């Protein structure tokens, strides 16, 4: 039923595609359309991240988690993530998705993806990969 290590496998696959786009941005500016794609990749990577969180705490007997905010708070309190505000900012970015046809909105989410979220995603991957081995 609930299998947090399988969810982690898909999270890694999604993050690898986000990493491709984040690396591309270091070689040249992204077009407006590529920025929309970077946002889409952030969205499917973040969605998997907090569902890994939810799945992991279900094993611990926690059935009270229902969304990304609940999952992010429990992860911070249990030490799975260190940058609590950044992970909460990700949720704000998710809630701005419908408005990214405004370049100011798209550009803000892209700057956060490149300068903060990707690093946090990689740290969470490494954290959970260690816990799986245990």
Binding status of residue 122 toward a copy of itself by CB under 8 A: no
Rounded distance, CA 115 to CA 19, Å? 12
Residue of the chain from 28, 61, 101, 126 that contacts a copy of itself (CB under 8 A)? 101
Nearest to 43 by CA among 102, 115, 98, 101: 98
Q: Are 89 and 22 in contact (CB under 8 A)?
A: no
Binding status of residue 36 toward a copy of itself by CB under 8 A: yes
Binding status of residue 118 toward a copy of itself by CB under 8 A: no
Give the DSSP letter string of 19-62.
HHHHHHHHHSPPPHHHHHHHHHHHHHHHHHHHHHHHHHHHHTT-
Nearest to 117 by CA among 22, 36, 32: 22
Binding status of residue 44 toward a copy of itself by CB under 8 A: yes
Give 13 or 78: the residue with its C-beta nearer to a copy of itself.
13
| 81-100 footprint of a copy of itself as x/- string (CB under 8 A) | ----------------xxxx
Binding status of residue 35 toward a copy of itself by CB under 8 A: yes
Q: Are 121 and 7 in contact (CB under 8 A)?
A: no
Give 78 or 99: the residue with its C-beta nearer to a copy of itself.
99
| 51-80 footprint of a copy of itself as x/- string (CB under 8 A) | ------------------------------
DSSP code of residue 114: I
Contact positions toward Mg ion, by CB under 5 A?
40, 43
């Amino acid at each position: 039923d609930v299998r947090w290590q399988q969810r982690l496998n898909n999270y890694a696959r999604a993050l690898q595609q986000l990493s491709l786009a984040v690396n591309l941005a270091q070689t040249r500016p992204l077009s407006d359309l590529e920025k929309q794609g970077l946002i889409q990749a952030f969205e499917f990577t973040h969605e998997l991240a907090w569902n890994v969180m939810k799945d992991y705490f279900f094993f611990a007997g926690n059935s009270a988690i229902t969304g990304s905010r609940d999952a992010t708070r429990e992860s911070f309190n249990k030490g799975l993530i260190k940058e609590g505000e950044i992970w909460m900012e990700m949720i704000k970015s998710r809630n701005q998705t419908s408005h990214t046809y405004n370049q100011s909105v798209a550009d803000e989410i892209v700057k956060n993806i490149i300068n903060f979220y990707h690093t946090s995603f990689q740290a969470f991957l490494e954290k959970m990969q260690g816990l799986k081995e245990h």
